Every structure is written in C-alpha cells, then in structure tokens.
C-alpha cells in the first residue's frame, strides 16, 4: 500500500505540473471564492461581441476557438501521460495509439472540472460561457456541448478532487483495448497497478462514498459513449458545412478512429 500512495502522490504532482487550471482553482472561480477575476460572462450575442477579446458566423467562430483549446489540452495531456511510470518505455507506436484513442475521454473528464449546471469556464478561467447560450447555437453546433454538461453534472456529484482525478485520468490513458495496440500486456500491467492505486485513493479520501470505485469504472464506459456521439456530430459537420476543416493535430486524432 505504501508504494500505491507514493504512486498516487507522484501522479498528483505531475498533474499539477501539466495542467495549469486545476479543479481546485476552477471551483474557486466558479463559486466566487478567489481574490482576482471574476470571469467575463458570455450569455448572448451581444456579450459574446463585448467579450470576444478573451480570448464567419458565430457558431463557426466558437467551434474554431474550441478546436484550439482542444489542441492545447492534447499537448497538456501528452505531457502528463509521459509522467506516468512505464509509459515512455512502451513501444512508441503504442504510446501514439493510447493518446489517439484516449485524449478526448480525458478532455471531457477535465472539462467537467470547469463546468457547473449553468455554464463553463473558458480561456483559463477568464470567461464563462452559459449552457443556455451554447444550446441556442444553430444545429448541429448547439448539440455539441449539452451531452458534456449532462455528463459533468452527474460526474461532479461524485465530488472528486484533483488527487483522485490524477489517478482516474492515468487509468483511462493506459487502456489495453484500444484498436491496433502491438503489445497489450505491459499496458495492462501498468493499468492494473493504477487501478489498485485508484481503489486505495478512493477508500482513504472518500471513506463514506460506498461503491465510488465501481461508479468511476462506469464513468469510464460513459466517456466512451460521449466520444462516440461526438464523432457522429463531427461527421454531420463534415457532410454539411463546406467551410470547415479540423486543425492538423485533430485531423490525426480523428483519422478513421
């Protein structure tokens, strides 16, 4: 068990190094408990115009902004993955596969930290875009964020902290069932050890939360469904919307996939 706690701490320290906006910092902003801020609130077309300097029709401008944020998040997640013990020693093509098929599940996990039932922190906490505003955007654009909000409200009800999240995200990255992995055994061995560390973390940090470990295993399955639904919406954009194309890093991630 002592080695499991040292692993949990290592992952938390690496998470703090990799991700500039943590859940602790985001919840402080959202609940107004910070010295600085407050974020600029975007709730309609006029406030979007007023706030656009933090940081082509509106729906498409927002979709573009979101791609750049996704690309930044992929880079942060890649840095974190390289800190998971054993990961850089995997076959390099398998590291690519784990990131390709895992990074969006991690993006949606971490996006929940920035969300409440009414909206989402944007631009490293300098803006707050309302859920209602995003839902108001024309189809299919108004359909992208809503399922992520639905996920987030239920996920946030588990009250995980950054120490818990650091292990949960590592577990998801080290999934041995991703398509086209060359050597699954070492990946499964790292994941088994991460799962043991997650179980002990939840027992110690959430002793009264009965079956929390089981609930997190289910959220890992839920995240795969969120990704499936998201890819279907991306396909609608590709078939319609002649204007648009994805950032090259997202083109790689979505290539077949």
């Amino acid at each position: 068990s002592a080695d499991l706690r040292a692993l949990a701490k290592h992952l938390y320290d690496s998470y703090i190094k990799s991700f500039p906006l943590t859940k602790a910092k985001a919840r402080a902003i959202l609940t107004g408990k910070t010295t600085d801020k407050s974020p600029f609130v975007i709730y309609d077309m006029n406030s979007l115009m007023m706030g656009e300097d933090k940081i082509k029709e509106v729906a498409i401008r927002i979709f573009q902004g979101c791609q750049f944020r996704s690309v930044e998040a992929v880079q942060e997640i890649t840095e974190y993955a390289k800190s998971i013990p054993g990961f850089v020693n995997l076959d390099l093509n398998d590291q690519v596969t784990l990131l390709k098929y895992g990074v969006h599940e991690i993006i949606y996990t971490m996006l929940a930290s920035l969300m409440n039932k009414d909206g989402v922190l944007i631009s490293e906490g300098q803006g707050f875009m309302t859920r209602e505003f995003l839902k108001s955007l024309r189809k299919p654009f108004g359909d992208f964020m809503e399922p992520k909000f639905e996920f987030a409200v239920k996920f946030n009800a588990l009250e995980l902290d950054d120490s818990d999240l650091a292990i949960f995200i590592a577990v998801i990255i080290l999934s041995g069932d991703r398509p086209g992995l060359l050597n699954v055994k070492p990946i499964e061995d790292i994941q088994d050890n991460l799962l043991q560390a997650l179980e002990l973390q939840l027992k110690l940090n959430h002793p009264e939360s009965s079956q929390l470990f089981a609930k997190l295993l289910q959220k890992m399955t839920d995240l795969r469904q969120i990704v499936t639904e998201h890819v279907q919406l991306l396909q609608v954009i590709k078939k319609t919307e002649t204007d648009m194309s994805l950032h090259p890093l997202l083109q790689e991630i979505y290539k077949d996939l």
Binding site: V74, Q75, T78, K82, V88, L92, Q95, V96, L99, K100, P248, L249, E252, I253
Partner: peptide, 9 residues
Amino acid sequence: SLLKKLLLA
C-alpha cells in the same frame, strides 16, 4: 505523426 513528435520532445 504529430502525436509522435509531441511524445518525443
């Protein structure tokens, strides 16, 4: 190929 570049840095 971009993921590989990020991984190697």
